[PDB]
Tab-separated table of C-alpha atoms and ligand atoms in Angstrom:
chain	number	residue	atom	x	y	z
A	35	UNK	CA	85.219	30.261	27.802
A	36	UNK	CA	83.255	30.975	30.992
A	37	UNK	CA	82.607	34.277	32.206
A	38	UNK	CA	82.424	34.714	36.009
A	39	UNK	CA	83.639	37.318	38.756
A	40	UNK	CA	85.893	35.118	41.126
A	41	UNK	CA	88.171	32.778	40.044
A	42	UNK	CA	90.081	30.941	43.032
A	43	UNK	CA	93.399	29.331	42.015
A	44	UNK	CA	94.264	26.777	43.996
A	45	UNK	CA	92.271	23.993	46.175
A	46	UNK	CA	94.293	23.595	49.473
A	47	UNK	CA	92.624	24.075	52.520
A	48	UNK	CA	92.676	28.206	51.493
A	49	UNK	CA	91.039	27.595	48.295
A	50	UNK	CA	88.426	25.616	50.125
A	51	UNK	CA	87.964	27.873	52.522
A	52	UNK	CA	87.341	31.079	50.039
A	53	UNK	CA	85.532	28.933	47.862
A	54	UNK	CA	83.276	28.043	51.049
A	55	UNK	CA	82.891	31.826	52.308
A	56	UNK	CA	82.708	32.705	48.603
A	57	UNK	CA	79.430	30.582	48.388
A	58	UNK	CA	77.294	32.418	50.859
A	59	UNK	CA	77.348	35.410	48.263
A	60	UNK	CA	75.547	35.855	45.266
A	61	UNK	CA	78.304	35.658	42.615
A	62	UNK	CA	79.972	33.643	39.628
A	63	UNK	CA	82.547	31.987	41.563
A	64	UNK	CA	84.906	29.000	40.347
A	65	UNK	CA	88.012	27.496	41.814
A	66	UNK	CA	90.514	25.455	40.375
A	67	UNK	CA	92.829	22.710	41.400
A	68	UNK	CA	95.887	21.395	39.076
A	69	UNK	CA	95.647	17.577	40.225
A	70	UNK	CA	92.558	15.612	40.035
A	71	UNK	CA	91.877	15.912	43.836
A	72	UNK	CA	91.718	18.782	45.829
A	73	UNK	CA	94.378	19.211	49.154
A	74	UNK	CA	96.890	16.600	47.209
A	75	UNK	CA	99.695	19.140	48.272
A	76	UNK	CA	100.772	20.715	51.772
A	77	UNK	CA	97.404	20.405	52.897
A	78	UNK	CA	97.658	16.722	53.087
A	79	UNK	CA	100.974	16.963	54.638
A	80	UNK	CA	101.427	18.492	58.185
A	81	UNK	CA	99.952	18.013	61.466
A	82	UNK	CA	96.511	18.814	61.541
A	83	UNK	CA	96.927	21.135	64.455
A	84	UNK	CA	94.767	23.928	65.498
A	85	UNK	CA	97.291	25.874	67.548
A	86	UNK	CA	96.387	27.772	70.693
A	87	UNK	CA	99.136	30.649	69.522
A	88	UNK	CA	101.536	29.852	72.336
A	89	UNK	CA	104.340	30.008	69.250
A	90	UNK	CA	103.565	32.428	66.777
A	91	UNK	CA	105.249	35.851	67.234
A	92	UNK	CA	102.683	38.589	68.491
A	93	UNK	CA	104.007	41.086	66.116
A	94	UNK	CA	103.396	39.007	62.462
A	95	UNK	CA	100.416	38.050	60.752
A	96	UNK	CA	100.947	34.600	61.329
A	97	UNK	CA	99.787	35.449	65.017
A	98	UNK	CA	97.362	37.188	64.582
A	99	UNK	CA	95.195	35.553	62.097
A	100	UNK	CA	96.461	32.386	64.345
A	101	UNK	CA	93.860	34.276	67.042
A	102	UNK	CA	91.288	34.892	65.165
A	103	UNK	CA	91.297	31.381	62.704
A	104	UNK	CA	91.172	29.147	65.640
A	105	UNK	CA	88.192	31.299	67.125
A	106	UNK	CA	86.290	30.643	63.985
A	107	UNK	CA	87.274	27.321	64.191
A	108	UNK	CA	85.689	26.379	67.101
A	109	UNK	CA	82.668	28.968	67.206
A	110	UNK	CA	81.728	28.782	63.837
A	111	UNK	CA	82.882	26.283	61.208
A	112	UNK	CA	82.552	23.515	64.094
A	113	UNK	CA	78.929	23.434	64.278
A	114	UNK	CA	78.228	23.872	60.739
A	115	UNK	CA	80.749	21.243	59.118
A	116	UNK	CA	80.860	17.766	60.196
A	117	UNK	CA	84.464	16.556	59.568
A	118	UNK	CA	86.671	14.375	61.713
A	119	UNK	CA	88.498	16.280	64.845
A	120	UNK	CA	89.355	15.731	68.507
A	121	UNK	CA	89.976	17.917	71.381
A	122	UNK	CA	93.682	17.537	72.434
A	123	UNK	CA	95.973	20.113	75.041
A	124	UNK	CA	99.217	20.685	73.941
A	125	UNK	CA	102.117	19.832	76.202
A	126	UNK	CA	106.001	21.357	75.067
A	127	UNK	CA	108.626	19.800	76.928
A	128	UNK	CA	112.265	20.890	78.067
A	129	UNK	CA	115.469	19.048	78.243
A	130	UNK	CA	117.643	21.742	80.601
A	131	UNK	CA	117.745	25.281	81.457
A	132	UNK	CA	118.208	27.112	78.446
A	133	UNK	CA	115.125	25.235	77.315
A	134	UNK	CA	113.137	25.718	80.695
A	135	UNK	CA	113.439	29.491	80.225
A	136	UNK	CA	112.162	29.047	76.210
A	137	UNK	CA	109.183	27.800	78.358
A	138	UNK	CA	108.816	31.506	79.913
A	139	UNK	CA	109.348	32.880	76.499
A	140	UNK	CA	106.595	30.931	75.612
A	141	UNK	CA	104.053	31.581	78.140
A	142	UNK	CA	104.624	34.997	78.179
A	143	UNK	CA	104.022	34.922	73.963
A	144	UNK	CA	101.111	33.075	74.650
A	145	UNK	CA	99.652	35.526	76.866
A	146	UNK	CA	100.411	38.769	74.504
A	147	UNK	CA	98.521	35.955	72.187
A	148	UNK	CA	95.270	36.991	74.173
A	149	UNK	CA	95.941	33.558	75.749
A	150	UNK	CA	93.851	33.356	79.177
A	151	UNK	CA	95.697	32.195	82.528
A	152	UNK	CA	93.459	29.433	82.792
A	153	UNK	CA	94.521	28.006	80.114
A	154	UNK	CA	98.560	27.493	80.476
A	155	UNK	CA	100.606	25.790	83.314
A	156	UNK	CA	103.971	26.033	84.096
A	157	UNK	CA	105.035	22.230	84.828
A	158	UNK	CA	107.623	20.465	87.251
A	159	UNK	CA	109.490	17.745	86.083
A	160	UNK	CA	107.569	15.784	88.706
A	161	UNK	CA	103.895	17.240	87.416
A	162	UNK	CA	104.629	16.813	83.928
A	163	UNK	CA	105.489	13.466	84.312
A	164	UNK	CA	102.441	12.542	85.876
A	165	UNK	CA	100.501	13.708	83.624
A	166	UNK	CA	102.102	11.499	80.608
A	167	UNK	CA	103.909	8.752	81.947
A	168	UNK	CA	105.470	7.888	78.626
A	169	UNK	CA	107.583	11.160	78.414
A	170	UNK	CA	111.084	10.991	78.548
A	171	UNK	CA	111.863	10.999	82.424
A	172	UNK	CA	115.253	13.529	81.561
A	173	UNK	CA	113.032	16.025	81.131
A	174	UNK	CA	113.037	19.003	83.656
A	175	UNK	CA	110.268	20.973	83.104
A	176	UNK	CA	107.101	21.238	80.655
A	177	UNK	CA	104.133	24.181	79.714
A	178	UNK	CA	100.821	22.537	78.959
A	179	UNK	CA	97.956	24.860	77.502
A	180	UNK	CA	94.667	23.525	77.250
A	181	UNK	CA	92.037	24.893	73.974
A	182	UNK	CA	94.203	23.039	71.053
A	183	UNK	CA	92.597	20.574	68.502
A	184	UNK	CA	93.698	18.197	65.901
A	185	UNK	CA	92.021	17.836	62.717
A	186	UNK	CA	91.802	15.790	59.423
A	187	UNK	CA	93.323	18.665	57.251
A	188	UNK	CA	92.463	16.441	54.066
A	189	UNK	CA	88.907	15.975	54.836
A	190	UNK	CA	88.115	19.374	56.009
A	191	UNK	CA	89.348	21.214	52.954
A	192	UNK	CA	87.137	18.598	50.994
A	193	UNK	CA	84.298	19.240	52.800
A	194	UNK	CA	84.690	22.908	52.771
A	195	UNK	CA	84.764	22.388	48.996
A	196	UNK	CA	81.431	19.912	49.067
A	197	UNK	CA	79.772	22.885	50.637
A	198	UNK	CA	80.677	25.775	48.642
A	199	UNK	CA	79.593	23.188	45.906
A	200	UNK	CA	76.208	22.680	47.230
A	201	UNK	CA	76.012	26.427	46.945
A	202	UNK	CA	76.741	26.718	43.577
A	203	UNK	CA	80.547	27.445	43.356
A	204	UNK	CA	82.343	25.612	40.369
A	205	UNK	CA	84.895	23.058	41.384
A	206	UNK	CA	87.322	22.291	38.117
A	207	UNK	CA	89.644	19.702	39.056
A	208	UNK	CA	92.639	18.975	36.468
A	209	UNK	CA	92.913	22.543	35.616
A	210	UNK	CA	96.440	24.108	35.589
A	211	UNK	CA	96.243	27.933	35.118
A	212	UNK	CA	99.418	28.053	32.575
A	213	UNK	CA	98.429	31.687	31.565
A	214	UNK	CA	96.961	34.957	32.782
A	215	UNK	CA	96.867	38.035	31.368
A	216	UNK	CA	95.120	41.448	32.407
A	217	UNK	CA	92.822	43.370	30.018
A	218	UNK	CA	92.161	46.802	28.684
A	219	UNK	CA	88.880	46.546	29.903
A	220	UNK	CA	89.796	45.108	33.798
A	221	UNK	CA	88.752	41.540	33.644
A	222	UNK	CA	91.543	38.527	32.955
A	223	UNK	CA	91.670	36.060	30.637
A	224	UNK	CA	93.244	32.879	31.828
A	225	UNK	CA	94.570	30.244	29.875
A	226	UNK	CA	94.679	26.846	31.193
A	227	UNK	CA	96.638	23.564	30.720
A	228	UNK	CA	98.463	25.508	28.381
A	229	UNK	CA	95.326	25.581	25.672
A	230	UNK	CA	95.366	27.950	22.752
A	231	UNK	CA	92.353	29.848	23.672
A	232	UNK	CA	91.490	30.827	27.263
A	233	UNK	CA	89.063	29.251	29.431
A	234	UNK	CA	87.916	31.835	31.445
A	235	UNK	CA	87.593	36.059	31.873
A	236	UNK	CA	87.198	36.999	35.591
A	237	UNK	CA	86.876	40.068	37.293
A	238	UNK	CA	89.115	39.160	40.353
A	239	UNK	CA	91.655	36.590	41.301
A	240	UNK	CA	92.362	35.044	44.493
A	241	UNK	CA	95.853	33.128	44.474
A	242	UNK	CA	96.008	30.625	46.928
A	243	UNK	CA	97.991	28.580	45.242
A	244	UNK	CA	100.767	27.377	47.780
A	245	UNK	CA	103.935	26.838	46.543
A	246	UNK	CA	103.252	28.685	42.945
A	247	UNK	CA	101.136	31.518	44.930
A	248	UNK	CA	104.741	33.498	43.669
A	249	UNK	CA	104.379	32.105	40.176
A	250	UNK	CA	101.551	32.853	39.788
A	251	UNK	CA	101.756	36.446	40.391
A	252	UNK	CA	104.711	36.739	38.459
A	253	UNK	CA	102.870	35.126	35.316
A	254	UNK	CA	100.334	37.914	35.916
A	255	UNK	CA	103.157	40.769	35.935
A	256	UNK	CA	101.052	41.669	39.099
A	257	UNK	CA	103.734	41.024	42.663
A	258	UNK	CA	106.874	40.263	42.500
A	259	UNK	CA	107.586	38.329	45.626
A	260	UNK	CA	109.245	34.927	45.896
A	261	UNK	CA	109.068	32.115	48.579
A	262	UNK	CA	111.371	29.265	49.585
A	263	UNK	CA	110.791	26.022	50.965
A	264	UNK	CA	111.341	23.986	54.256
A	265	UNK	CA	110.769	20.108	53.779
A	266	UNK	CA	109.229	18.225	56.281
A	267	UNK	CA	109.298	14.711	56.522
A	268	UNK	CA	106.934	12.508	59.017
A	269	UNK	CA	106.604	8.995	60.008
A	270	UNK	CA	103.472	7.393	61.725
A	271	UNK	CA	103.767	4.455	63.902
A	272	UNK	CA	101.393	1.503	65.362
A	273	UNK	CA	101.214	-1.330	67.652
A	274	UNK	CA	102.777	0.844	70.483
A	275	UNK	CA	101.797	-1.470	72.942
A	276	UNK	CA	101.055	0.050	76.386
A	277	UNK	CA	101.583	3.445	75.302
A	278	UNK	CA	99.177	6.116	75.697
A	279	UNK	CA	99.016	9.660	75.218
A	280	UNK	CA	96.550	12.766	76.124
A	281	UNK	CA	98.435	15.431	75.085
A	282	UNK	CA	100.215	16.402	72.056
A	283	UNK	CA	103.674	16.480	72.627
A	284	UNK	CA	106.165	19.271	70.973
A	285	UNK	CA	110.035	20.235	71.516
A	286	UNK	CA	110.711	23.700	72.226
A	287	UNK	CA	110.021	25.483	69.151
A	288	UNK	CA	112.822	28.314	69.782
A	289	UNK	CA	115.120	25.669	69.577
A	290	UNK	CA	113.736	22.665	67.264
A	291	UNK	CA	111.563	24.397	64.842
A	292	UNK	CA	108.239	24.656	64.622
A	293	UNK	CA	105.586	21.831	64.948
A	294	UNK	CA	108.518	19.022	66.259
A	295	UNK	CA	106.061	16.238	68.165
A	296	UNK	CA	104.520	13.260	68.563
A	297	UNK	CA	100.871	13.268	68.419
A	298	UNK	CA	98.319	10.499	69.309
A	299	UNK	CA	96.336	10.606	65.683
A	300	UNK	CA	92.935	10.334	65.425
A	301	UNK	CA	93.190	6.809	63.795
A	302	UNK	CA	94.278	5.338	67.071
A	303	UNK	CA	98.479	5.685	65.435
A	304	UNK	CA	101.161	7.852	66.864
A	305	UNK	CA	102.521	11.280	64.352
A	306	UNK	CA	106.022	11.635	64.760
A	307	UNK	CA	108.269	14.278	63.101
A	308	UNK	CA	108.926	16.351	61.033
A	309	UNK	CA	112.475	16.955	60.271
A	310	UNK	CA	113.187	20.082	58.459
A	311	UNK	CA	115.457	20.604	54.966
A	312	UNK	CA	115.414	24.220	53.625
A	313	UNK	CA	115.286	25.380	50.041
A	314	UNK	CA	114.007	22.486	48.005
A	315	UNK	CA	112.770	22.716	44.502
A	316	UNK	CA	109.146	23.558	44.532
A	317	UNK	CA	108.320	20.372	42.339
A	318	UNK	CA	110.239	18.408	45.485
A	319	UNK	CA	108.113	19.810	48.266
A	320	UNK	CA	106.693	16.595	48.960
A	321	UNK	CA	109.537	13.876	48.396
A	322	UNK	CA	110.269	11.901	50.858
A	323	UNK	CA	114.188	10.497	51.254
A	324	UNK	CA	115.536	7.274	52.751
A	325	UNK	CA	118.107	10.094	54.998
A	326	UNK	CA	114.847	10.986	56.752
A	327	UNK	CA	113.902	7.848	59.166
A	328	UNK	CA	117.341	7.837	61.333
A	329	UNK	CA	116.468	11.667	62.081
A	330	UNK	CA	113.305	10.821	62.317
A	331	UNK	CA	114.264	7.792	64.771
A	332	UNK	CA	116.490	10.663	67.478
A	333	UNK	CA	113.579	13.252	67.530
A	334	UNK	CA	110.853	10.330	68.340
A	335	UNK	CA	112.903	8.364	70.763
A	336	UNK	CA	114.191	11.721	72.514
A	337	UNK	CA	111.064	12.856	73.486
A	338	UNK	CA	108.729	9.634	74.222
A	339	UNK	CA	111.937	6.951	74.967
A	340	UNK	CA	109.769	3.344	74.613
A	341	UNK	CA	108.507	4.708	71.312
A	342	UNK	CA	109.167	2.138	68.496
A	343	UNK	CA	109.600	3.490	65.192
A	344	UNK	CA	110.280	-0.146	63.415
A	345	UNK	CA	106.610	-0.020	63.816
A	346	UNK	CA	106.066	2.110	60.880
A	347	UNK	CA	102.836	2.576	58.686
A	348	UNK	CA	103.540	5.405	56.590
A	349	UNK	CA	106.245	8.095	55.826
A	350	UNK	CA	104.829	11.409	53.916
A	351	UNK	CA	106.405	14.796	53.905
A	352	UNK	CA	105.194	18.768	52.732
A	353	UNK	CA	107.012	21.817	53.122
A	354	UNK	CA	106.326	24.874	54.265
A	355	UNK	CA	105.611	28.120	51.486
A	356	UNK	CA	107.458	30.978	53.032
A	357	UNK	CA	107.807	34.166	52.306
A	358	UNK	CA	111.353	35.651	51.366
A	359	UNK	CA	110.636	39.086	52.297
A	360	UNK	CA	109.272	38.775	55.394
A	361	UNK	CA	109.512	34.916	56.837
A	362	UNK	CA	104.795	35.711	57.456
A	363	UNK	CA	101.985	35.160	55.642
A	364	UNK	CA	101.210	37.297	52.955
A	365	UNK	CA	97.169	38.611	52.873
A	366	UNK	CA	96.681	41.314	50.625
A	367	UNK	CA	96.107	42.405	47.171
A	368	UNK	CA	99.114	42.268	44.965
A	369	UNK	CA	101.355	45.537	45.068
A	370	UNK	CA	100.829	46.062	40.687
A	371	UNK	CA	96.887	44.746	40.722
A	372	UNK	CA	94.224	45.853	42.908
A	373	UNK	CA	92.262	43.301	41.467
A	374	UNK	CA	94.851	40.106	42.503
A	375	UNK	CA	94.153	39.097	45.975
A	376	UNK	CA	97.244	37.109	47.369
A	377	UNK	CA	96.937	34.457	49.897
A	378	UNK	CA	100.976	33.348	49.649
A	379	UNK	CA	103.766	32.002	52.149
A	380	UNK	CA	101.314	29.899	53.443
A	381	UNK	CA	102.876	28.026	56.248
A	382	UNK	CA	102.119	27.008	60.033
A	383	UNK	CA	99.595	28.278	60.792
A	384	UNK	CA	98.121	28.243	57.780
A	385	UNK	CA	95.512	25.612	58.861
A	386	UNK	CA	94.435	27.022	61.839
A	387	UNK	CA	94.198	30.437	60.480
A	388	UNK	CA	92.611	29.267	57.269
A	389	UNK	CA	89.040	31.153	58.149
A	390	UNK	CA	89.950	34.363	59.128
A	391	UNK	CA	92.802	34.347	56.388
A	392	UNK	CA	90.059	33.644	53.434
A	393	UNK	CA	87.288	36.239	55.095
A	394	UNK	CA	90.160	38.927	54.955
A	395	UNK	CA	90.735	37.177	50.898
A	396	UNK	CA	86.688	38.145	50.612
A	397	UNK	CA	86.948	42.166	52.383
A	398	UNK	CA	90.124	42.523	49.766
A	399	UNK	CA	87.925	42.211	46.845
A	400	UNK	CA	86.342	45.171	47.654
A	401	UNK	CA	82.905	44.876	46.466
A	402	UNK	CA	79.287	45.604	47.897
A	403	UNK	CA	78.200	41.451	48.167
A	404	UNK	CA	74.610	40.804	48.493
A	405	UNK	CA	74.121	37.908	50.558
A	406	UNK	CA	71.604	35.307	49.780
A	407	UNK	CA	69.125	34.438	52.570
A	408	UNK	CA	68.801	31.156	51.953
A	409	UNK	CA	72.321	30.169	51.852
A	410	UNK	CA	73.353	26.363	52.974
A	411	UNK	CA	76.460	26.660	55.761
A	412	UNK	CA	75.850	23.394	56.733
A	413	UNK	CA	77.682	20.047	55.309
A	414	UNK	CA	77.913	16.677	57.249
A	415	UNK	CA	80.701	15.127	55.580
A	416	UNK	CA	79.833	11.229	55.348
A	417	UNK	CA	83.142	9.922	56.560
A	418	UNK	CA	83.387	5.987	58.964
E	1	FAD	C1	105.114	19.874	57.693
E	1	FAD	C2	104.037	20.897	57.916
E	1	FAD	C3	103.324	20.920	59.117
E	1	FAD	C4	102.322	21.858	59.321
E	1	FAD	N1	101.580	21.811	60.487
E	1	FAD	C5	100.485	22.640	60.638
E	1	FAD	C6	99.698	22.535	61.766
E	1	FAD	O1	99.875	21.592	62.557
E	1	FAD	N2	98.742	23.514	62.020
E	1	FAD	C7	98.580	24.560	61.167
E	1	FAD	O2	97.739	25.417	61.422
E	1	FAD	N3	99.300	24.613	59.991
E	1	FAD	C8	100.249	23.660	59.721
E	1	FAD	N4	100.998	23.744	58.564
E	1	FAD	C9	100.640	24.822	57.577
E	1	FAD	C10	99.524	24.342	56.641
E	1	FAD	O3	99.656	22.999	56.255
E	1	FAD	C11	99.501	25.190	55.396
E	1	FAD	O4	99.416	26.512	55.839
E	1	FAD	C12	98.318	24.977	54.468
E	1	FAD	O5	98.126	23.594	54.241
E	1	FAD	C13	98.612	25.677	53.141
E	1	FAD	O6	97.434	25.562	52.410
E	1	FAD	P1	97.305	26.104	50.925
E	1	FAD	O7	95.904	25.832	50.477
E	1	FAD	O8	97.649	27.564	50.756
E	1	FAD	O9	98.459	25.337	50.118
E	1	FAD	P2	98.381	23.945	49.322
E	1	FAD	O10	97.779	22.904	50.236
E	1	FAD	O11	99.829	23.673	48.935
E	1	FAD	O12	97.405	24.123	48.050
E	1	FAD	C14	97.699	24.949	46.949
E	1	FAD	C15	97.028	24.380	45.729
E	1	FAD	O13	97.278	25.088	44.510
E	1	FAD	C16	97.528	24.142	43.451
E	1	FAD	N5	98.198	24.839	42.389
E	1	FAD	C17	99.464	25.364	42.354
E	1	FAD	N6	99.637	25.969	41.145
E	1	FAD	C18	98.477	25.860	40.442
E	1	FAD	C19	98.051	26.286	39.194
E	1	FAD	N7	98.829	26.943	38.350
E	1	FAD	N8	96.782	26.002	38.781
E	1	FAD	C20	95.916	25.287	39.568
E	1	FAD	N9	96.337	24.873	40.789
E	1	FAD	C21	97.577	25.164	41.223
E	1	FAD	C22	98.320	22.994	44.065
E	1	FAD	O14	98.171	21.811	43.333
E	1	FAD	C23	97.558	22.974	45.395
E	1	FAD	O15	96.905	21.819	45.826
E	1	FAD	C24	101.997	22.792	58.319
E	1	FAD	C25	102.728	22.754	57.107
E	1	FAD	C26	103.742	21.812	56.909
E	1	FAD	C27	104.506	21.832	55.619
E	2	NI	NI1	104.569	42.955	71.588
């Protein structure tokens, strides 16, 4: 049984990313993962998008740690962390009228954002079109904001996890937390893999663990909030031919859902999807179905038209973790446990929010950390 002051629970991109800021501190810090790999789960599975925060409601968490992720991002974690990542604009079309005046909706939601002008352009038909010739031509109208990036989600969290390594955080891999239980004294024991004796006694908890972030408060008696699911299925496609692409290209997400595009990927391939199922079993948040493709087929084919999907390399899905209560992210310690912080309903934008989400995980601690002043952000992922 290891004593230590942190332990993270879960090694998504959030884990990574607290186990990353974590590291700069001097403290007993470990973080476990369930599988044998860390970001197996809906960290592998969505876009890769760092959003400009054209979409996310001004009002809710999700757009306002949307502002301040993607500023730490591109300011900060970019010039420390070597991972792969391109610059990319991000173009949302319309079909007709209803959906031109989304558009409006948008760029005024961008703006309350802390968007700046410069940034977003209200498109004609005519402009949009020359800027991606591939587009489907019935298109009236399209908003293009410039500042978006796409990542590689997968090696990102890894590498955030290589460097709070390097800096002495403990990475256990194939470690299920099974049970947790509060002491007279303040700390936790926490049983894992369903072993007889515990494994560790902590003095704090950070749940990040995605789709059980709910279980897992509930198995500490600590919060009693519950999330459900949306299922998202992708496919990517090759050998497009004369195809090319410099923006990432979404529906209206008023009207489609969030995050509905086709994206040239960083591999050279074309992203298309994802459809959208709600309320799947937690267990079946990654499944992908044979219903999927023929969706999949409209929403590709309706937005770039000489887009052939027979070309297919891959099909994944995730789903989103979203909070019942309040459809946001939830960033705070647990209502019954000053001592639990929550990092739950962990959905889009997650990702792009992931560093200022896990620096508010570190405040919510509450503690007096002592910094060392030696302490190694850097990490050049070796990735060809
Ligand atoms: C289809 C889709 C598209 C998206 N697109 C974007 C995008 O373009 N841009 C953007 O910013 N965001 C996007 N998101 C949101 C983003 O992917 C998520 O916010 C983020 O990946 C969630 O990270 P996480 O670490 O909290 O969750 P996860 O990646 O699910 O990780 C949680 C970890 O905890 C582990 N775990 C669970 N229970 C236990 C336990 N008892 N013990 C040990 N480990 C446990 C799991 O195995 C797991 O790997 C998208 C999401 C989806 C579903
Ligand atoms: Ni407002």
């Amino acid at each position: 049984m290891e004593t230590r002051d942190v332990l993270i629970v879960g090694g998504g991109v959030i884990g990574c990313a607290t186990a990353y800021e974590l590291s700069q501190y001097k403290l007993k810090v470990t973080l476990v993962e369930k599988h044998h790999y860390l970001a197996q789960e809906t960290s592998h599975a969505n876009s890769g998008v760092i959003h400009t925060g054209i979409d996310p409601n001004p009002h809710k968490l999700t757009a306002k740690y949307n502002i301040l992720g993607k500023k730490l991002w591109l300011n900060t974690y970019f010039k420390r962390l070597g991972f792969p990542r391109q610059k990319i604009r991000t173009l949302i079309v319309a079909f007709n009228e209803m959906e031109r005046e989304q558009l409006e909706v948008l760029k005024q939601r961008g703006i309350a954002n802390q968007i700046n002008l410069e940034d977003i352009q209200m498109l004609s038909k005519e402009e949009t079109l020359k800027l991606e010739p591939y587009v489907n031509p019935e298109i009236v109208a399209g908003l293009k904001i410039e500042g978006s990036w796409a990542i590689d989600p997968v090696l990102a969290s890894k590498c955030l996890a290589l460097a709070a390594q390097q800096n002495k955080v403990q990475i256990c891999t194939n470690t299920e937390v099974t049970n947790i239980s509060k002491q007279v004294d303040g700390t936790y024991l926490v049983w894992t893999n369903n072993e007889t004796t515990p494994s560790f006694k902590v003095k704090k908890i950070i749940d990040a663990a995605g789709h059980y972030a709910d279980y897992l408060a509930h198995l500490a008696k600590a919060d009693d909030f519950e999330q459900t699911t949306r299922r998202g299925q992708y496919v990517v496609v090759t050998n497009q031919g004369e195809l090319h692409l410099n923006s990432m290209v979404f529906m209206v997400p008023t009207i489609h859902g969030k995050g509905v595009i086709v994206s040239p990927m960083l591999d050279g391939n074309f992203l298309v999807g994802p459809t959208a199922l709600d309320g799947v079993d937690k267990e079946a948040t990654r499944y992908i179905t044979k219903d999927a493709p023929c969706m999949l087929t409209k929403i590709g084919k309706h937005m770039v038209p000489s887009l052939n999907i027979n070309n297919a390399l891959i099909s994944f899905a995730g789903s989103r973790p979203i909070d019942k209560a309040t459809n946001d992210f939830i960033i705070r310690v647990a209502h019954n446990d000053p001592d639990f912080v929550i990092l739950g309903g962990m959905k889009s934008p997650g990702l792009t929010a992931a560093p200022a989400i896990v620096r508010e995980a570190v405040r919510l601690l509450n503690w007096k950390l002592t910094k060392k002043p030696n302490w190694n952000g850097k990490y050049n992922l070796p990735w060809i």
